[PDB]
Every structure is written in structure tokens, then in C-alpha cells.
Amino acid sequence: KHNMKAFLDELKAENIKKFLYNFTQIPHLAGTEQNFQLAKQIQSQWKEFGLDSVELAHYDVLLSYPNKTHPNYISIINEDGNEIFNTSLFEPPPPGYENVSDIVPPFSAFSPQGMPEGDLVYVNYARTEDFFKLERDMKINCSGKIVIARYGKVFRGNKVKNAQLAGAKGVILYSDPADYFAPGVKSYPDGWNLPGGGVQRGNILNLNGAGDPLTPGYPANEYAYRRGIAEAVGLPSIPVHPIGYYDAQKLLEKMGGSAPPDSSWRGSLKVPYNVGPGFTGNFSTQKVKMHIHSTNEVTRIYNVIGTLRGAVEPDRYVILGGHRDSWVFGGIDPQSGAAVVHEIVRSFGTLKKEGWRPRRTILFASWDAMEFGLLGSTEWAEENSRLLQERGVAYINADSSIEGNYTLRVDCTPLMYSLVHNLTKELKSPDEGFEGKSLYESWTKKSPSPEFSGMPRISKLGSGNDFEVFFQRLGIASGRARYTKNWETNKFSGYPLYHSVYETYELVEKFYDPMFKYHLTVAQVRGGMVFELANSIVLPFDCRDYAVVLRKYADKIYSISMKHPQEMKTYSVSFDSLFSAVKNFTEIASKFSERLQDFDKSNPIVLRMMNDQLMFLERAFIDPLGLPDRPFYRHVIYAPSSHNKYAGESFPGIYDALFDIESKVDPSKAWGEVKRQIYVAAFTVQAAAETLSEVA
Amino acid sequence: KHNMKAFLDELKAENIKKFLYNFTQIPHLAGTEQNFQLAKQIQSQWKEFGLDSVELAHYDVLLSYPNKTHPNYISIINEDGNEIFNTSLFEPPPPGYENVSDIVPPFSAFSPQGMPEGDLVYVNYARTEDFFKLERDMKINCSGKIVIARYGKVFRGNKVKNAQLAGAKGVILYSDPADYFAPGVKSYPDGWNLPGGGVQRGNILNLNGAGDPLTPGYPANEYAYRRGIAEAVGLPSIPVHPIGYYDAQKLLEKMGGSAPPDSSWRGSLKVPYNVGPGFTGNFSTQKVKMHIHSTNEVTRIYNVIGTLRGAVEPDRYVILGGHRDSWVFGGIDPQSGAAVVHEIVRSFGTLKKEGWRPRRTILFASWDAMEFGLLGSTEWAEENSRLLQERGVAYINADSSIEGNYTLRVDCTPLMYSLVHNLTKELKSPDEGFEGKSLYESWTKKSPSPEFSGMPRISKLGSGNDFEVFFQRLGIASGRARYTKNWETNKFSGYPLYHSVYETYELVEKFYDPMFKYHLTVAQVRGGMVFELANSIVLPFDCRDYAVVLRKYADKIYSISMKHPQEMKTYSVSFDSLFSAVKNFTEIASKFSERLQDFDKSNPIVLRMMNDQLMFLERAFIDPLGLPDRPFYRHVIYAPSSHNKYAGESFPGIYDALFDIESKVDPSKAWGEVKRQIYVAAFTVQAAAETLSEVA
Ligand SMILES: *[C@@H]1O[C@H](CO)[C@@H](O[C@@H]2O[C@H](CO)[C@@H](O[C@@H]3O[C@H](CO[C@H]4O[C@H](CO)[C@@H](O)[C@H](O)[C@@H]4O)[C@@H](O)[C@H](O[C@H]4O[C@H](CO)[C@@H](O)[C@H](O)[C@@H]4O)[C@@H]3O)[C@H](O)[C@H]2NC(C)=O)[C@H](O)[C@H]1NC(C)=O
Ligand SMILES: *[C@@H]1O[C@H](CO)[C@@H](O[C@@H]2O[C@H](CO)[C@@H](O[C@@H]3O[C@H](CO[C@H]4O[C@H](CO)[C@@H](O)[C@H](O)[C@@H]4O)[C@@H](O)[C@H](O[C@H]4O[C@H](CO)[C@@H](O)[C@H](O)[C@@H]4O)[C@@H]3O)[C@H](O)[C@H]2NC(C)=O)[C@H](O)[C@H]1NC(C)=O
Ligand SMILES: *[C@@H]1O[C@H](CO)[C@@H](O[C@@H]2O[C@H](CO)[C@@H](O[C@@H]3O[C@H](CO)[C@@H](O)[C@H](O)[C@@H]3O)[C@H](O)[C@H]2NC(C)=O)[C@H](O)[C@H]1NC(C)=O
Ligand SMILES: *[C@@H]1O[C@H](CO)[C@@H](O[C@@H]2O[C@H](CO)[C@@H](O[C@@H]3O[C@H](CO)[C@@H](O)[C@H](O)[C@@H]3O)[C@H](O)[C@H]2NC(C)=O)[C@H](O)[C@H]1NC(C)=O
Ligand SMILES: O=C(O)CC[C@H](NC(=O)NCC[C@H](NC(=O)CCNC(=O)c1ccc(I)cc1)C(=O)O)C(=O)O
Ligand SMILES: O=C(O)CC[C@H](NC(=O)NCC[C@H](NC(=O)CCNC(=O)c1ccc(I)cc1)C(=O)O)C(=O)O
Ligand SMILES: *[C@@H]1O[C@H](CO)[C@@H](O[C@@H]2O[C@H](CO)[C@@H](O)[C@H](O)[C@H]2NC(C)=O)[C@H](O)[C@H]1NC(C)=O
Ligand SMILES: *[C@@H]1O[C@H](CO)[C@@H](O[C@@H]2O[C@H](CO)[C@@H](O)[C@H](O)[C@H]2NC(C)=O)[C@H](O)[C@H]1NC(C)=O
Ligand SMILES: *[C@@H]1O[C@H](CO)[C@@H](O[C@@H]2O[C@H](CO)[C@@H](O)[C@H](O)[C@H]2NC(C)=O)[C@H](O)[C@H]1NC(C)=O
Ligand SMILES: *[C@@H]1O[C@H](CO)[C@@H](O[C@@H]2O[C@H](CO)[C@@H](O)[C@H](O)[C@H]2NC(C)=O)[C@H](O)[C@H]1NC(C)=O
Ligand SMILES: *[C@@H]1O[C@H](CO)[C@@H](O)[C@H](O)[C@H]1NC(C)=O
Ligand SMILES: *[C@@H]1O[C@H](CO)[C@@H](O)[C@H](O)[C@H]1NC(C)=O
Ligand SMILES: *[C@@H]1O[C@H](CO)[C@@H](O)[C@H](O)[C@H]1NC(C)=O
Ligand SMILES: *[C@@H]1O[C@H](CO)[C@@H](O)[C@H](O)[C@H]1NC(C)=O
Ligand SMILES: *[C@@H]1O[C@H](CO)[C@@H](O)[C@H](O)[C@H]1NC(C)=O
Ligand SMILES: *[C@@H]1O[C@H](CO)[C@@H](O)[C@H](O)[C@H]1NC(C)=O
Ligand SMILES: [Ca+2]
Ligand SMILES: [Ca+2]
Ligand SMILES: [Cl-]
Ligand SMILES: [Cl-]
Ligand SMILES: [Zn+2]
Ligand SMILES: [Zn+2]
Ligand SMILES: [Zn+2]
Ligand SMILES: [Zn+2]
């Protein structure tokens, strides 16, 4: 038979390993020839694998690169202006790659050029609360200072935004061993830890969903009319550069001024972690100088778009997408995910060659320029927004398949919770000690849901990955899954060698997944989800699961507001309308579910009506006016946190209206805006509910 | 059989007459008890007529009313401050209605309160070009003057906006006999002309599609959070009041200053039409004083919403909608249209009682508060926007059925041109001299298309009517039709007694349509369109007709730009991308049309795919970012003219970027924005075309 089991059984660990090796021998930086070559290779292979059509979709977008003949670096300069200490110009290449060309040196993409020199202030992780603590509690002024922040906890773009608004004239990011060196594990190449010379690359934009900085709203095609740089979206105004902890140590060791306010401010280096500003007495006349000469330039990028036409509903699209561009070799990020996508295409293509086709169309995407701001997926979705919004069933992302070897991690819309539960109950656990048990069982045991015994944790979607346009802009149900670490063991924001030259094929093959069994489990979950979404007669979404979480989020936002009981009385702030809408959603969804079970199974119009109702339910949470000052975040239930693009926030409009409200100078105005956001959320919830009522 | 002919034949002129009489005996001003009573009556009757459900949808919206105990009026005051001349407090009521209560006196709805006193400037029709001529050519400064403008040519809201931006401190609108008195016809009650004491009511908002001024974006429901008045949308900042030509004569006769610049500035009164400012020598110390005391107040309004559930595609909606609220008796506007809707419901209900149902769902709407800014239809569409955008097939409007007795007038999306041509070829002409001929034949003869011999004129949709939210905001194919006058005979912007107390049942029965045959023809066209839209297996839209007009509009906008050849060279302004997109649209639409003809007629999925492609084609012209500073006008091909809300403009983004461009102080910036609009239009056209490509 051609069923899900045939699909799953065709997937092979050994194929994923071969593809990963193939994709990670040279760098594939967005906009470079090497990445265009790989694009053409994957196009060719997807065609040979059997897809009906495979095309490149190219765009001309703003990227950023260091100047090869004018290196970025930071100095300590003495009062004479002699540079007495200089940070590294490159990471020491790993064994056997010391002759690889075109390894981009560490840099912060989209930094402006400049050579600011000043006194250092240490700002911990540069989170909103870290700046609050500096200004409000410690009375330290960052205006005109160079800020040094440790990576971790939040997206680095938010750090840079926060430093700018504090008045910093430059930012230095570094990786502290506290956050990127797991105790008892060796540095690469002998373990999976970050060495003192390792550095995390990465962009520092604040795009808020816009895509290419020059063309917000519209694809960066041949004839596009670009904004000038001064009106581009999301560019930082101060120079920024990342360094490793050997170099960080040499910048921090001299710091004077105030002590760190508490231990949550101290990392693991042998330094006091003084906040500054500036250096202790003997060194007080020395300063820090950055030298940044990177350039922004419009550069062509290439997405690969594969189509497997549906047999019955070709005008319904289930999309499996993940990026192909990497900072250097991309051993984990993204090629561990791209190798999984490749094998999924291969497997679906095998069935197709034997005469099968999915019920609905499957689109496969190899996105470009993700590392420079989700540019490739966003431009493509801008180009294709009307097809995607009227035909898009679901989007399954496929970045890094592994970031650990402990258990599964899934973030998705509530509409996919039941699908994920049911699919994982069918799959075999790859975990030691769970031989012959289901993935559901191992996952639930290692990662229990905080709410419900006997179920696993599934998180909301955040951002910083290629689902952002499809979910928070366009309202297409989205999900993602990968293998991850035990967050109780270390609690780091990622894996140590993230975005470093040390992220290699050997990293994965030797330390993360020698038998490629976690990769295979991830291919089964991602591929399985796509299979069911594209082949189930009734779409596999359970609207009742949205009702349950909407109540949890309404409770949560209410509890936040209820910290201000006097203001709620003064300004008559009521959540009654939101709870009412949620109650109605619960009731209507329950009735819809009965019809879906009970409808006449011979009637394809009733079926498609109810599949359209299922498909357009995520779509109903979109507000076409967007959230305040973030027009490309239109989903009213979920947006990326305004303080950390990686994290999702629920009822974001209300949350941001309530955030730090006790500090606003005009409370009447501030609480007015809370009430406005309550109204918008209540209305959108009720409106979404009504899409599930009988249609006439 | 139950077919279109059965539907059409059930319609009776005598029923329309009875309903019109029934709807016009007392005033039905929005927000009054009398209009809520009529709402309940139409709800009851639509249920008895056989609709499946009929509900009221109510909203609480900003309306405006004069103060009953503090009348609005204008004076000429002498230097002592004695009011030596006062305009009327009411229109002399027509015969037999001199005892009717609650006739609202003439006023401009949403005027602020004030009693400004100043010198008069006469500004012709207060169009953009009239102000250009005053400031630029005649060097007359309106700052701090009271402006007197004749009604006509453009929507009165645009006049008030234009007067404000000229710095006027108040506006007086009047009806000039040149524009509202047809030569050789008697004044009401002895003819259909406006008497000297007649006055045109009407709102003076600039909403740009927003709906209720306090709640843009969201329905004005129970829990809505309102803007304060100072942030409301579209309210005028200067007092405004309309008067008749007896009173206008007494204001204009003393005017001094400059002569009218030419005869296009002179109306028909026995006055010189001097532009002013102020009065001639002997009267130079006299001034004009307005006294406006109207109040804005949030008031409940009621739409009636009738549903006739579709047998096969209940989740596809064909909407017939028109308003019910009137300024006074509403003899033409709107009850001549509402009486037609009522008979259409009756006819469809007769078929339903005999066991028939349309293929798709038909929604019938009796809108409220249209006269105060299309409020009722817009709030309802805001409430229901997600159902309408995913399920809305078409909207047919149904305001005034007649404004003359000469020939048909149709404005609609190009997608309905073929439908209208085919339907009118089936219908009998009611015109004298065309007995036994088709409506198509009489209409084509009396109103030839400017482009194509042997076809009739069909105009683009403008605004100032209840289709605005459905078409220009939501992108649902829309159309309207009514009987009209011979524009070659007089060329007035409407009919003389528009929005006056004299617009009565007797006006219609005695002067416009004694045998109710034009009303019946209009019921057949509107009802016929709804019938085909709701019952045709393939939706009756021809995408090729859009391709033909897109080329006409691209030629037109190109020709406008080509008046500035030097700037097009300097700033490299090319229309190549727009023409390219239009060419592609033409090619793809041609291929789609072949598939639509040729597809396998047994396959309902292919059918519905192609019906969805047809339905979502108007939808593809929507840009969710809206046009510049007009977020609720999102259609890129059509918007209401920025200079006259009643008129439609094509490629409005480009048109407004080019308008008066030779006056802009920064030409680089201005031509940049032209190019930006070219890109947006080319992209949207191509994107719309691609919705008609094979789906996978
Ligand atoms: C969750 O779902 C429920 C439905 O089960 C919704 O209930 C509606 O709630 C609103 C209140 O927010 C009710 O509004 C009230 O309607 C009365 C008239 O309703 C009748 O007539 C309408 C048509 O006009 C019918 O559709 C309806 O069935 C009724 O027969 C008004 O008279 C009320 O206004 C008066 O009282 C209020 C409050 O004290 C005053 O502010 C007013 O000035 C006025 O005096 C009121 O407008 C509505 O009728 C309910 N519909 C039902 C029960 O079907 C919830 O609203 C929904 N939650 C959300 C968030 O949408
Ligand atoms: C109306 O419809 C036609 C289709 O019939 C569209 O034609 C496309 O037009 C654009 C030009 O605007 C062409 O873009 C060019 O593509 C070249 C590569 O294309 C190949 O590879 C792609 C995938 O990457 C395939 O999809 C495609 O089939 C081709 O095989 C580029 O190399 C060109 O760029 C080079 O030249 C330009 C111009 O001189 C330079 O600016 C660049 O820097 C670079 O040197 C160019 O990008 C596109 O290929 C055409 N597609 C076709 C024929 O199918 C029209 O665009 C459309 N009109 C609108 C308004 O959309
Ligand atoms: C995940 O798996 C669960 C368990 O199989 C699925 O729920 C089950 O779905 C079936 C099929 O609809 C339900 O059967 C139905 O029962 C009703 C009422 O008794 C009957 O009238 C119908 O004819 C039909 O047989 C079954 O009750 C239900 N079991 C539950 C909820 O415990 C669930 O649908 C799956 N989720 C997906 C596919 O997203
Ligand atoms: C308005 O009426 C015209 C004239 O009836 C309609 O166009 C006609 O539509 C029919 C039905 O699709 C076309 O017939 C088809 O012809 C093709 C090609 O020869 C054949 O392969 C199909 O099987 C089918 O018989 C007919 O050609 C066409 N006539 C024209 C264009 O002159 C038009 O569709 C109507 N418009 C509407 C309903 O909106
Ligand atoms: O411009 C942008 O918006 C982002 C560009 C670029 N993106 C990435 O590097 N993405 C991979 C890293 C990303 N990290 C996080 O989400 C941090 C916390 N959550 C998880 O790791 C986490 C979340 C869900 C799951 I399932 C597993 C882990 C990730 O893991 O996706 C960057 O950040 O520089
Ligand atoms: O707030 C708003 O946006 C408008 C509120 C209110 N609306 C109306 O009174 N509508 C009826 C008058 C309107 N007039 C025009 O369109 C003027 C030129 N075109 C036609 O008459 C014309 C156009 C198409 C056809 I078919 C027939 C005649 C009309 O005729 O619909 C008002 O204007 O005060
Ligand atoms: C990755 O695998 C691809 C595909 O097998 C290899 O590209 C092929 O290389 C052979 C030998 O040079 C050529 O004859 C084919 O034309 C290539 N195929 C395609 C589709 O490009 C590639 O060599 C491998 N890369 C590495 C580094 O191993
Ligand atoms: C850090 O790098 C800087 C720049 O290369 C070094 O300073 C330069 O040294 C050369 C050779 O002695 C001089 O001719 C240049 O004028 C210097 N340039 C600047 C900008 O100062 C510096 O010596 C290096 N410091 C260390 C400790 O290696
Ligand atoms: C308009 O017609 C309606 C409906 O025929 C009339 O309203 C009815 O009046 C009778 C007699 O008063 C009542 O018994 C019914 O309950 C009413 N029906 C409904 C549905 O409201 C109304 O009288 C007519 N109005 C005018 C001015 O002629
Ligand atoms: C126009 O109306 C105004 C207001 O009614 C008249 O002026 C008033 O006249 C009364 C009675 O003589 C005075 O007591 C008021 O003080 C006046 N009010 C104002 C505001 O002036 C005026 O007489 C009327 N003019 C004409 C020509 O009829
Ligand atoms: C890079 O730096 C070099 C050498 O210092 C300079 O000549 C060149 O203009 C720079 N390239 C850029 C700005 O792309
Ligand atoms: C920080 O310093 C700058 C000037 O050096 C000043 O404008 C700003 O107000 C200061 N912030 C404080 C002390 O709050
Ligand atoms: C793989 O799992 C083992 C056993 O739990 C663990 O000790 C090791 O740290 C893991 N490797 C990685 C890279 O997480
Ligand atoms: C209307 O005018 C009267 C009498 O001059 C006044 O008492 C009342 O407040 C006004 N009503 C309003 C503003 O609605
Ligand atoms: C019109 O008059 C006002 C002041 O009375 C002035 O501010 C404005 O500039 C004048 N406009 C002209 C003469 O252009
Ligand atoms: C009705 O038609 C006649 C004959 O053409 C015309 O003279 C008369 O003015 C028309 N009535 C109206 C109200 O247009
Ligand atoms: Ca873009
Ligand atoms: Ca509103
Ligand atoms: Cl992922
Ligand atoms: Cl109309
Ligand atoms: Zn990645
Ligand atoms: Zn990455
Ligand atoms: Zn009207
Ligand atoms: Zn009107």
C-alpha cells in the first residue's frame, strides 16, 4: 500500500547522513556563488527525486558582509592612541579545514561602519530588565558609552535595540562560558563546547517581520522600488561586533566602577564583572575602540521551490520549508534540517514514481538568506501572498534537526496538537531505555506538559525562524519539531557552537548523532506531519485545542492586569468581553467538532466547507491592521515578544499595553490603550469563533 | 420550472408601488424610533416572505442632529450687530404634509458648533481646481473668510475638506438653479424641480472608507472602545450649513471684490457672482454670521440581515444590499430602491415556498445610517470581514431605483460586464419607442459605450454608496444599476429634489414613474444579476474583461505621466513593468478562460477550484497595506477619487502621486513616489494574474 507507513519506512538514517556530509564541506553564505551552486544542485536532485516542478525563485535583497581588505576588530587604546590589545581577526579553523577558503570572519550582519572609542559599560545580557536595573536602580548612564553584553537569553537584535535606546555608541557581544560551556565537556574538536577563540555570528536587525529591509510589503523583484538606506527597516544605528571569551576576558578584566548588582550578573570568567563605566584606577585613561567597515549591499538570493501536485485538491498547499544558507559550514544550522528535508522529498518522490500522489499539493522550499533576517521565505511569501492566504493549509518548518540528544521539542499552533500527539504515538522512540516504546511515551516522560499529566510539553511558536511570515503575517497554521537537550541539565539558550566555524559535519557525526537516529526520528515527525496534513480527508486540526489555550492565555493576561487593581477600578478596565469571547469560542468549537464527526461522509461540498472552515480558522486570528507599530505581526493571539524575537507572547497587543505600565506618565492614556487592546482581542476571538458557526 | 424566468415573472410593478407608498409616509431618519419601527416591519415581512432567518444587527455609532430648541441659521449682520437677514429655519412642507412631525430641518451632518462671523468668498463648486484658480491665479486668500459654495460636480465632503485646507472659518452650501432647476420644468409640487425654499441635506465627513468615526477597523458593538471626538475619523473642523437659492440670492447679491474669472463660475441667479471677499462699498461693513448648534451623539442603528441558505454551496454568499434610512421621506433616496429589494425578496421567497433554493446562499440587507457615512453597511462588514472575504461572491447594491426616466445606468466591476450584457439582452425594454425590443438594445442606443460600437456604457464604481466597504475595502466583485436621465439634456450631478423634504411618494408616482415600469426593469436587472450570481454553476465572471480595462487604465495613467517627459527622463520613470503585468494578465486570463470552457464538467473540485479562482480574482487586487494615508481603500485598481468621493479613479495610487506634481517642491521625492506606485500596481496586477494560473 501507499500509506503513511510506506512513506515513513522509505526514510533512511544513512541517506540523511550522506546528504549532511554533502551539504557541509564548504561554506554556503547567502549571496555567494557557493550557495547558488548548492541551490542548483538541490533543484536538480529534487527533479530527479520525482517532483512535478522545481524552480528557483530569486530576489535582490539587502545583505551585509565584512570588507575582506579592511578587517573588523576591537582595541584597547592607551592615552597616546597606541592599540595595546586587539581582538582576533578570525576563529582558529578546525582540524582539516585550516585551508578552506571564504570562511566569513565573525561579524554582526548589518552593523553600520564606524570607529567609536569610549568607556565600557557591562550590561549583562542587555535585556529590557538589565537596562531597567542599570538606569533605574543603579543610576548608571549608558549614553555615549560602548556597551559590552553577553550573548544568551534573548535574540541579539533586541539587545542592540535596547543598547541603542539606552544611548550606547557601540555594542560588543561576547559568548560567556557560563552560557556556552557545559561543565565537564571538552572544547571542539574534542567535545561539543565552545573554545575561547570561538565566536557566534548573526544578524542584529529589528525587522518585526518586514523581510528585505528595502522592500517591506512587496517582493524584491526585478523592478522593485527600494527605500534608501536611511528609510530601510530595522537597521542598527551603532556599530556592533561579536567576540569570543578569550578576547572578552581581556576587555572585562580591567573594568571598574560599580560591582555587579548580584550573582545573576556574573558569568564564569575570572573577572569581577564590574558594570563600569570604564576601567579601574591604573587603567582609567585607557579606552575601547571598535573598527567596523562591513558594507550593506543588495545581492541576489535564490529559493528552491518544489511542487508535488495534489490528486484531489491541487489548490490546497501543505508547505515543508527550511533554509539552506549558513554562516559557515552549517553542520547543525541549517544543514541537519536541510538533509532531513532532502530525504523527505526523496521518500515522497519514491511513492510518486509508483503512481501515488498526495490528496493536496505539497510544496517543498529551500530558503535563502534566512541568516540575514528570514529574507528568502519572507520575499517569496510577499510575492505569493494571495495564493498562500486563500490556499495555504499548513507550514512545517525544517531548520536544525538536532540541538541536543535528549528528547523531542515541538512548537506549533494549537490546531496541530492532536495531530502531533497521534503521530508520535505511532513512531518508535530512538531513546536509550525506551527500546520498543513510542516516541510519545519517551517524549512525555522526559518533557511533561506543565498543565496535564500524561501529555508532553508543546510550546507556542516564537520567531527567529522561517515560519514567521506564514504564521504571524499570513495566519497559516504552522509547526516545527527537532531533537533538543535536557533544559534542566544546563539551561543554555542554544548549543555551544551555534553560528561558529566549529559547527561541522564532524560535530554532528561524532558528538550529537552518530547513528543518525535522532535525525531519522525528526524526519519521521516532520514528514509524518506533512503526510497527514496533505493526505487526511478531513484536515487534522482540532479547533477545541485552540479553545483550551485561549482560556489559559486570557487567564494569564488577566492576572498580569490584576497586579494594578486600583487602576482597573479607576479606569473601569474589564476583561469580561475577552472571557465572553473565549467562552463562545469554546461552545461553537464544540458544536463544530460534533458536525465534523457527524456530517454526511458521502458529501464532498460539506467536507470541503468544513475543511475550509478548518483551514481559515488560523486565518481568522489575523488583523489586517497589524499590531501597534508592527504591521507585519497581524496575528492577535501570537506575536514574537517585543523584548525577545525568539520567544512567543500570547495576546501580545494587551501584553505590550500592560508592560511597564506603572512607569507611564499618562496613566489614563496607558489604561485606555489596555482597554482598546482588550476590545481588539475579544472581537477577534469572537470573529474567529463565528467562522466555525453554521455558514448559513 | 424554477429558473430565472420564473423569478423575473413573479416581480410586479404594482407590488413595488405599494411598498414604496408604505415606506414613505413618515420620515425614517437614522437613529430615530420611526426607523427602528420600519426595521422591525421589514424583518417581519422578510420572514413571512419565506427567508430562512432574518435578524437585526445593531451598532452604536456617531450620528449628528440639529438642536430642536436652538435652530441653525445664517445671518447678515450690520456693524451694530443687528441681524438684518436670516436664512430659513425649515423648508416649506409640501401639500398634505404640513402637519407631519419630526421632519429634520436642513443641516450639514457632523458640522461642529460655532457662530463665526466674517466676509464671504464665493468659491464656485469648491473643487480642487476652483481653489487652485482662487489662490494661484486670482491671488484671493480664503484664510479666515466664510466660504459660500454651490452644490454640484463633487461630493460635498470634499468641498468642506478643500475649504478647510484653504483656511476658511465656515462653509455655506447652496443649491444654484443652474444645477438644480431644469429649464422648462415646474417646481415641486407642480413639477420635479427644486423650489427656492428647497434645501439639500447631507453629511460632510471625509471618512475614506472608515465607517463609524469612533471605531475605525472594528464593529461598534456593545464593548467597543471608542476614540475621543478629537481623534475621530473624518470630522470637519469648521461649521457648515446648506441653504436654498432664495436665501443664497440674499447672501450673494451684495458681493463685491473681483469679478467671477469666467462664465463657468456663474450660476443662474440674478447676481454678478463676484468672488469677493466681502460686500460692495455701501455694504462693506456688513458681515455674514453662522449659528450652528448641532450635536454629535452615539446612537443605536439597526441593519436587517435576511438569509436564503444555498442548496449546494451554502458557504458562498451573494449579497443584495441597500439602505433604509432617509433624510426625510426618502421617496427616491432610498425607498425607491428599498421597495425593489422588498419585491425581490418576495419573489425569491415565492420560489422557496415551492421547494426551490438557490445554489449559493443569498444575503439580503436593509442598511441603516447610510446617510451619515455608509455606517451600517461598513460596521456590519467590519464585524463579518473574515466570513465576507473567504466566502463573498458578489455584492449588488440597491439604493434609488430611478433618478430619471431615460435609460439604464450600470456601474460595476469588469468581472460583471458579460453577465450584465447577457442579462439585459433577455429583458424587455420599458422605453417608449422600443416596445418588443430588449433592454440591451434601448440602453445601447441611448447610452453608447465610448469605446465599442454596438455595446452600452458601463462605468467604473465610484463611492458615496453602500458597496464601498465590500468593493474597495474587502475586494468582493460589486455592481449597481438604476434608471437615469439623459446627461446630454441637462448634465446635473443628480436630480433636483435630492435630499429635500420634497422627495416624496408623489414625486415618483406623478413625475418619474407613474406605471412603476422603470422600477420593475430595475428589479429585473438587480434581481436577475443576483439570481445568476447565486445560481449559475460556473460563476458568471469573465476575467478577460478585466484584462481589457487594465490596458485602458494603464494607457491612461501613462498618458498623464507623459505630460512630464523631462522628469520621466531625469528620474528614469518607466511604465514598462505595468504594461508587462497587464500583458501577462491578458495571456493568463485567456488561458484560464479556455480551461474554464474545456475543463471536465463532471468534476466538482475542478469546478469549485475554478469558481474559487473566479471569486478570489477581485480579491487579488486588494493590498493589505491600503493606499497612502487611506488604509480602508485597499483596492489597487479602483478607489474613490481623492477630489470627489462619488467618482471612481483608476490606478489611484499612481494617479494621486502624479496629481499636481509640477507644484511639488522636491521633484526627486515626488517622482520617486510615482515610481513606487508604478511598482505596487505592476506587482498587484501580476499577482492577480497568477491567481488564474494552474494552481500546481
Ligand atoms: C458571546 O455570545 C453571546 C451569544 O450567546 C453574545 O450575546 C450577545 O451579547 C450582547 C451584549 O454584549 C447582547 O446585546 C444586547 O442586545 C439587546 C437586543 O438584543 C436583541 O435583539 C437583537 C437585534 O438587535 C437580537 O440579535 C438578539 O437576539 C436579541 O433578541 C439590546 O437591547 C441590549 O442593549 C441594551 O442593554 C445594554 C446593556 O445593559 C445597554 O448598553 C444598551 O444601551 C441597551 O439598553 C444589548 O445590546 C446580545 O443580544 C447577545 N446576543 C445573543 C444572546 O444572542 C455575546 O456578545 C458574545 N460575546 C462576544 C464577546 O461577542
Ligand atoms: C510577465 O511574465 C513574464 C514571463 O513570461 C515575466 O518574465 C520574467 O521577467 C524577468 C525580468 O523582469 C526575468 O528575470 C530574469 O531572470 C534571469 C534568470 O531567469 C532564469 O532563472 C530563473 C530562476 O532564478 C527561472 O525562473 C527563469 O525561467 C530563467 O530560466 C536573470 O538572470 C535576469 O537577471 C539578469 O538580467 C537583469 C536585466 O538585464 C539584471 O538586472 C540582473 O542583474 C541579471 O544580470 C532576470 O532576473 C524572468 O526570468 C522572466 N521569467 C520568465 C521568462 O519566465 C515578467 O516578469 C512578467 N511581468 C511582471 C511585471 O511580472
Ligand atoms: C487523534 O486520534 C484520536 C483517537 O483515535 C481521534 O479522535 C477520535 O476520532 C474518531 C474519528 O472521528 C472519533 O470517532 C467518531 O466517534 C463519534 C462519536 O462516538 C462517531 O459518531 C463517529 O462516527 C466517529 O466514529 C472518536 O470518537 C475520537 N476519539 C476520541 C476523541 O477519543 C482524533 O480525531 C485524532 N486527531 C486528529 C486526527 O487530529
Ligand atoms: C454570455 O453569453 C455568451 C454567449 O452565449 C457566453 O459565451 C458563450 O459561452 C458558451 C458556454 O461556455 C461557449 O460555448 C463553449 O464553446 C467552446 C469553444 O467552442 C466549447 O469548447 C465549449 O464546450 C462550449 O460549448 C461559447 O463559445 C461562448 N460564446 C461566445 C464567447 O461568443 C458567455 O459565457 C456569457 N457570459 C457569462 C455567462 O458571464
Ligand atoms: O533574523 C532572524 O529572525 C533570525 C535569524 C537567525 N536564526 C537562527 O539562527 N535560528 C536558529 C536559532 C533559533 N534559536 C532560538 O529559537 C532560541 C530559543 N529557542 C530554541 O532554541 C528552540 C525553539 C523551538 C524548538 I522545536 C527548538 C529550539 C532556533 O532554534 O530556531 C538568528 O537568530 O540569527
Ligand atoms: O457618506 C457617503 O459616502 C455618502 C452618503 C450619501 N449618499 C447618497 O446620497 N447617495 C445617493 C447619491 C449618489 N450620487 C452620486 O453618486 C453622484 C454622481 N453619480 C451618480 O449619481 C450615479 C452613479 C451610479 C449610478 I448606477 C447612477 C448615478 C448616488 O447616486 O449613489 C451622500 O452623498 O450624502
Ligand atoms: C554533493 O552531491 C552532488 C550530487 O551527487 C555532487 O554533485 C555531482 O557531482 C558529479 C561529479 O562532479 C557531477 O558529475 C554531477 O553533475 C553533480 N550532480 C549535481 C546534481 O550537481 C557533489 O559533487 C557533492 N558535493 C560534495 C562536496 O560531495
Ligand atoms: C593592533 O592592530 C593595530 C592596527 O594594525 C596596530 O597598530 C598599527 O601598527 C602599525 C605597525 O607598527 C602602524 O604603522 C600603524 O600606524 C598602527 N595602526 C593603528 C591604527 O594604530 C597595533 O600594533 C596592534 N596591536 C597589537 C597589540 O598587536
Ligand atoms: C406598511 O405595511 C405594514 C405591513 O403591512 C403595516 O404594518 C402592519 O399594520 C397592521 C395594522 O396596523 C398591523 O396589525 C400589523 O402588525 C403590521 N404589520 C407589520 C409586519 O408591522 C403598516 O401599517 C404600513 N404602514 C403604512 C404607513 O401604511
Ligand atoms: C433674525 O433672528 C435673530 C435671532 O432671533 C433676531 O435678533 C433677535 O431679536 C430679538 C427680538 O427682537 C432680540 O431680543 C434678540 O436679542 C435678537 N437676537 C440676536 C442674536 O440678535 C433678528 O431680529 C432676526 N432678523 C430678522 C430680519 O428677522
Ligand atoms: C574595503 O576596504 C578597502 C581597503 O582599505 C577599500 O579600498 C574599499 O573601498 C573597501 N570596500 C568596500 C567599502 O566595499
Ligand atoms: C546621560 O548623559 C547625557 C549627556 O552626557 C544626558 O543627556 C542624559 O540626560 C543622561 N541621562 C541621565 C543622567 O539620566
Ligand atoms: C548525548 O547523550 C549523552 C547521554 O545522555 C550525553 O551525556 C551527551 O552530553 C549528549 N551529547 C550532546 C551533544 O548533547
Ligand atoms: C440645545 O439647546 C438648548 C436651548 O438653547 C440647551 O438647553 C441644550 O443644552 C442644547 N441641547 C444639546 C446641546 O443637546
Ligand atoms: C492668508 O492670510 C493669513 C493671515 O491673515 C496668512 O497667514 C496667509 O499666509 C495668507 N496667505 C497668502 C496671502 O498666501
Ligand atoms: C420623463 O420622460 C419624459 C419624456 O422624455 C421627459 O420629458 C420628462 O422630463 C421625464 N421625467 C423625469 C422626471 O425625468
Ligand atoms: Ca520585500
Ligand atoms: Ca467601526
Ligand atoms: Cl525548525
Ligand atoms: Cl445603487
Ligand atoms: Zn537556521
Ligand atoms: Zn542560524
Ligand atoms: Zn441613498
Ligand atoms: Zn442619500
PDB file of C-alpha atoms and ligand atoms in Angstrom, chain B residues 323 333-334 370-371 399 465, ligand 23:
ATOM      1  CA  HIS B 323     -30.084  51.352   2.820  1.00  0.00           C
ATOM      2  CA  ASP B 333     -33.486  58.001  -1.969  1.00  0.00           C
ATOM      3  CA  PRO B 334     -33.545  55.194  -0.726  1.00  0.00           C
ATOM      4  CA  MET B 370     -26.068  55.180   5.260  1.00  0.00           C
ATOM      5  CA  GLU B 371     -26.841  58.890   5.072  1.00  0.00           C
ATOM      6  CA  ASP B 399     -30.155  52.426  -3.455  1.00  0.00           C
ATOM      7  CA  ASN B 465     -22.861  54.311  -1.644  1.00  0.00           C
TER       8      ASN B 465
HETATM    9 ZN    ZN C  23     -29.304  56.648  -0.647  1.00  0.00          ZN
END
